């Protein structure tokens, strides 16, 4: 108690502070592929 503590003893959950999570970078890879699902079905019947 005399000698140790500085500021890391009072660490306060250093999260992020804007954000760049992955998210939509997955989702866009679905969405255009959805057109690749659909617009090959040219109804030539």
């Amino acid at each position: 108690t005399l000698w140790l503590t500085g500021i890391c003893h009072n660490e306060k959950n250093e999260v992020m502070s804007i954000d760049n999570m992955a998210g939509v970078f997955y989702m866009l890879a679905a969405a255009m592929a959805l057109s690749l699902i659909t617009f090959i079905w040219e109804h030539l019947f």
């Binding site: 503590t5 500085g6 306060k12 804007i18 760049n20 969405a31 959805l34």
Partner: protein, 263 residues
């Protein structure tokens, strides 16, 4: 508060995504409206001025983009709540005073009883090279030292500091009452009138003459508690300049396109 804190590259990604929405809503019209329609549908749905209606798979993708728009609005409003609602010298127990630094120099006035309370205790040993090498002649010099931002904190009697904190917006009395003593009267040992004066002191405590000086000199003043903004004023400036530039381009573009149509 500020301008946009949200990583302006991300705002550019938002604008490019709006143009991707425009490209997707015009190129998929031809599978069964290609001039100025889907621009205003993109500014209808992506501004959420209209979320509703106006082949199948293109509109499936469009309402997926509307889902993106709602999630982005939710995330940015969550950040507006976060970065506005989310995240000092407390006393001798601080390492700023147990290990006193030169970025944190503190002082008093020499030949005072406060310096007596410093010099009595033992654990203030590192403090005496700040509290005896930097001192003043009046407490108003320490007040100005706060006001000139010379020294960061000061240690004085409680009542005057609470008064001056209730006066102006530079002062907060922090920490407990250090060295809890009483405020007495300088009386010689052979003075026979310690007696009836202290009886009058008992009367002052019992009949509230202490509370009478609390009314007549102590309890008068306060300050505010921070309770039409800088973000708002930035919105006024940006929206005003945008409306001026937009209107003064309306005349040019509509004049040239009306004379295109006159052809």
């Amino acid at each position: 508060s500020f301008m946009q804190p949200f990583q302006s590259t991300l705002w550019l990604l938002v604008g490019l995504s709006v143009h991707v929405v425009a490209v997707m809503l015009y190129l998929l019209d031809r599978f069964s409206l290609t001039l100025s329609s889907a621009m205003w549908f993109s500014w209808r749905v992506l501004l959420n001025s209209g979320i509703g209606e106006g082949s199948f798979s293109a509109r499936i993708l469009g309402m997926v983009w509307a889902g993106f728009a709602m999630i982005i609005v939710a995330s940015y409003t969550a950040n507006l709540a976060a970065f506005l609602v989310l995240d000092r010298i407390t006393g001798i127990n601080d390492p700023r005073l147990r290990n006193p630094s030169d970025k944190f120099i503190y002082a008093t006035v020499k030949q005072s009883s406060v310096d007596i309370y410093f010099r009595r205790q033992v654990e203030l040993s590192t403090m005496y090279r700040h509290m005896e090498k930097h001192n003043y002649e009046s407490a108003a010099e320490a007040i100005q030292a706060v006001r000139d931002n010379k020294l960061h904190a000061f240690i004085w009697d409680s009542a005057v500091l609470e008064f001056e904190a209730s006066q102006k917006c530079d002062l907060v009395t922090t920490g407990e009452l250090f060295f809890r003593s009483g405020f007495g009267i300088g009386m010689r040992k052979d003075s026979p009138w310690k007696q009836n004066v202290s009886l009058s002191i008992l009367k002052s405590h019992e009949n509230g003459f202490m509370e009478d000086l609390d009314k007549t000199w102590v309890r008068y003043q306060e300050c505010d508690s921070r309770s039409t903004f800088e973000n708002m004023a930035g919105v006024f400036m940006l929206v005003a300049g945008g409306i001026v530039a937009g209107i003064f381009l309306i005349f040019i573009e509509i004049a040239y396109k009306r004379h295109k149509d006159a052809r």
